[PDB]
Amino acid sequence: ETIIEDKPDEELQAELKDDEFSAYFSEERKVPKLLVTTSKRASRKCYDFASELLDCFPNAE
RNA sequence: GUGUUUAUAGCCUUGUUGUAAUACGUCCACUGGGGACUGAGGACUGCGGCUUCGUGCCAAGGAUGCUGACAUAAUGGU
């Protein structure tokens, strides 16, 4: 029963309008700034994939 | 060209001028550099040399000291 129906729900929208992600979906339009890091003492194999993940997301550090 | 005997060169031989020098052989428990490989052992003993003596010092029963570079690298293996 947790499946969201295609018909818009006012309870679901009331929850989201002041949610943790509300600053992104509101008229404020908070530009997302990403911080990608790894685990401690990672190898170059992790960096070759992290660089690709860095290409996917602009404005990511 | 023929024969000469220091001539306006000198050569050799001989004793001989103050002695030598040099080369070769040999020796120094005399000495100054360059290069390479090794560092086994692992408290102390020992034999020695310095030292007035030294919990002294030393090249004396086997390497120590001073540095520099790297973790996303350096180094080696398959």
SS3 A60: strand
Span CA (A46) to C1' (B70), Å: 20
**How far apart, in whole angstroms, are the C-alpha atoms of residue A50 and residue A3?**
34
Residues pairing with A60 in the sheet: A34
**How far apart, in whole angstroms, are the C-alpha atoms of residue A12 and residue A18?**
11
Asked how this structure was determined, the answer is cryo-EM
Span CA (A23) to C1' (B52), Å: 93
Strand B: which positions are within 7 A of a protein CB?
71-73
Span CA (A32) to C1' (B31), Å: 83
Who touches strand B, with Cβ under 7 Å? A 41-44, 47
On whether the CB atoms of residues A36 and A60 are closer than 8 A, the answer is yes
| Secondary-structure breakdown of chain A: helix, strand, coil percentages, each rounded to the nearest 5 | 40, 5, 55
SS3 A23: helix
Resolution, Å (one decimal): 3.0
